[PDB]
Amino acid sequence: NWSVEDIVKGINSNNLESQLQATQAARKLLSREKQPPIDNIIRAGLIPKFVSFLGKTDCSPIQFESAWALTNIASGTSEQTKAVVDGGAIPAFISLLASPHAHISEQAVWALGNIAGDGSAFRDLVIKHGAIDPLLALLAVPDLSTLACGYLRNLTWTLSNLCRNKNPAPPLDAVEQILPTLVRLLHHNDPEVLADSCWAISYLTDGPNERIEMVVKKGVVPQLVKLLGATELPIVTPALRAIGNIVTGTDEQTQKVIDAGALAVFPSLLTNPKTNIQKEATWTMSNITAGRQDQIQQVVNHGLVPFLVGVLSKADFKTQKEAAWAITNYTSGGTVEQIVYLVHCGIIEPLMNLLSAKDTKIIQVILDAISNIFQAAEKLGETEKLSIMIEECGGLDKIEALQRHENESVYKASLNLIEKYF
Amino acid sequence: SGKRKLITSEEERDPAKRGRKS
């Protein structure tokens, strides 16, 4: 490649063709895989010149080369992205969204995605400069299938970055403006478009329940459930995240997920070979079992209690923690008959085995579940049968030893259990 | 009251930015 000093000499020549050759040389240097010299390019003072080249309508090659060079600077650290914004790039890129040249409008989409992807402040600044209307205009075609694949994938990714990040979440009016286009992308048949649309929906549903409501009222839950069954892990992962976020909301929002048939996919998700899928599927189950008794009953009817026994018995420890929460929520909210059923499915032994975990939070969760199950047994007059079960599979020794445990809540709750039922 | 919203850390999240290599 060229040296930075030679690039600087060409860019400072005031000869447009020399500037174009040098900008292309910078693009190629910034495109190399190992440590592109972003900081050297910034320190040479080239960003303002690249931003001025974005405006050269009569020289579309230098618009493209500078757009690509700035895209790659903005793909770096926050300080590097800030150098691009400080150079005036945001309005210049928004102006290029109108370019008659698809490869230039695409590169402007890409650069704005990196700028907005830096964090909430630059996301909101891109929105304030008016990026959403011209971005959405690029997708205002009757059938997305007429657009080139790579172009559509870059637009979907940039829109997903306008949905991303919190503190604050994106402006409500901006979300309302984007959502109809995002729902169209969520029904497109390209796996990368589907994955990034699913990620965008997942960001929009991670937050207060009013944000969940805005998404669920667009009718996306059935499509998310379809995507939960996809064979591509890059689609299943964000589809499950979005479903998981939705069931953190109201009981009615959770019911939409159940009504769409989500629970029928969970035998597969709760045994998926990818640890993170098992983990987030068990997290999802734990928020469903925090639901109404009729929602717990659907978990039962779908045969999922054995699957929860299974993940509590053997899984990565983070998944086992989510399983313990699922059991504590189930026993907190469930009917006596639902809790009897949980014991008949075999929960006691794997619950007791996890009391050996060197993790204070999961111990507290498990002791809470045990107390809830004892309260069910009191209503049936069967606390003795339960005490026997817990002792025979080694649980009494562990609870007895947790009396001498450091944490406050642990030794309290464990003392209580022994005093009342042992 | 038992709902638990998503918690993530920085290492589990994947980058929001993408450079163009070719």
UniProtKB/Swiss-Prot annotation, chain A:
One of its GO terms (biological process) is postsynapse to nucleus signaling pathway. GO terms for cellular component: cytoplasmic stress granule; cytosol; glutamatergic synapse; host cell; NLS-dependent protein nuclear import complex; nucleoplasm; postsynaptic density. Keywords: Acetylation, Cytoplasm, Nucleus, Phosphoprotein, Protein transport, Repeat, Transport, Ubl conjugation. Residues 241-329 are annotated as: NLS binding site (minor). ARM repeats lie at residues 1-37, 38-77, 78-119, 126-170, 172-208, 209-248, 251-290, 293-335, 336-382, 383-422. Residues 68-164 are annotated as: NLS binding site (major). Ubiquitinated. Deubiquitinated by USP22; leading to stabilization and increased activity. One of its GO terms (molecular function) is DNA-binding transcription factor binding. Slightly detected in brain but not in cerebellum and skeletal muscle, highly expressed in testis and spleen. It is found in: Cytoplasm; Nucleus. Functions in nuclear protein import as an adapter protein for nuclear receptor KPNB1. Binds specifically and directly to substrates containing either a simple or bipartite NLS motif. Docking of the importin/substrate complex to the nuclear pore complex (NPC) is mediated by KPNB1 through binding to nucleoporin FxFG repeats and the complex is subsequently translocated through the pore by an energy requiring, Ran-dependent mechanism. Belongs to the importin alpha family. Consists of an N-terminal hydrophilic region, a hydrophobic central region composed of 10 repeats, and a short hydrophilic C-terminus. The N-terminal hydrophilic region contains the importin beta binding domain (IBB domain), which is sufficient for binding importin beta and essential for nuclear protein import. Heterodimer; with KPNB1. Component of a complex containing CSE1L, RAN and KPNA2. Interacts directly with CSE1L. Interacts with PLAG1. Interacts with APEX1 (via N-terminus). Interacts with FRG1 (via N-terminus). Interacts with ARL4A, CTNNBL1 and NBN. Interacts with ANP32E. Interacts with SNAI1 (via zinc fingers). Interacts with SNAI2 (via zinc fingers). Interacts with BAG6. Interacts with AIFM2; this interaction likely mediates the translocation of AIFM2 into the nucleus upon oxidative stress. Interacts with RSL1D1. This is Importin subunit alpha-1. It comes from Mus musculus (Mouse). The lineage of its organism: Eukaryota, Metazoa, Chordata, Craniata, Vertebrata. The gene is Kpna2. The chain holds residues 75 to 496 of 529 of the full protein.
Swiss-Prot record, chain B:
It comes from the Eukaryota. It is found in: Nucleus; Chromosome; Chromosome, Centromere, Kinetochore. Asymmetrically dimethylated on Arg residues by PRMT1. Methylation is required for DNA binding. Phosphorylated at basal level in the absence of DNA damage. Phosphorylated by ATM in response to DNA damage: phosphorylation at different sites promotes interaction with different set of proteins: phosphorylation at the N-terminus by ATM (residues from 6-178) promotes interaction with PAXIP1 and non-homologous end joining (NHEJ) of dysfunctional telomeres. Phosphorylation by ATM at residues that are located more C-terminus (residues 300-650) leads to promote interaction with RIF1. Interaction with RIF1 leads to disrupt interaction with NUDT16L1/TIRR. The modification Phosphoserine is found at S9, D14. There is a cross-link at K21 (Glycyl lysine isopeptide (Lys-Gly) (interchain with G-Cter in ubiquitin)). Homoligomer. Interacts with p53/TP53 (via the central domain). Interacts with DCLRE1C. Interacts with histone H2AX and this requires phosphorylation of H2AX on 'Ser-139'. Interacts with histone H4 that has been dimethylated at 'Lys-20' (H4K20me2). Has low affinity for histone H4 containing monomethylated 'Lys-20' (H4K20me1). Does not bind histone H4 containing unmethylated or trimethylated 'Lys-20' (H4K20me3). Has low affinity for histone H3 that has been dimethylated on 'Lys-79'. Has very low affinity for histone H3 that has been monomethylated on 'Lys-79' (in vitro). The Tudor-like region mediates binding to histone H4 dimethylated at 'Lys-20' (H4K20me2). Interaction with NUDT16L1/TIRR masks the Tudor-like domain and prevents recruitment to chromatin. The UDR (ubiquitin-dependent recruitment) motif specifically recognizes and binds histone H2A monoubiquitinated at 'Lys-15' (H2AK15ub). Phosphorylation of the UDR blocks interaction with H2AK15ub. Double-strand break (DSB) repair protein involved in response to DNA damage, telomere dynamics and class-switch recombination (CSR) during antibody genesis. Plays a key role in the repair of double-strand DNA breaks (DSBs) in response to DNA damage by promoting non-homologous end joining (NHEJ)-mediated repair of DSBs and specifically counteracting the function of the homologous recombination (HR) repair protein BRCA1. In response to DSBs, phosphorylation by ATM promotes interaction with RIF1 and dissociation from NUDT16L1/TIRR, leading to recruitment to DSBs sites. It is linked to A chromosomal aberration involving TP53BP1 is found in a form of myeloproliferative disorder chronic with eosinophilia. Translocation t(5;15)(q33;q22) with PDGFRB creating a TP53BP1-PDGFRB fusion protein. This is TP53-binding protein 1. It comes from Homo sapiens.
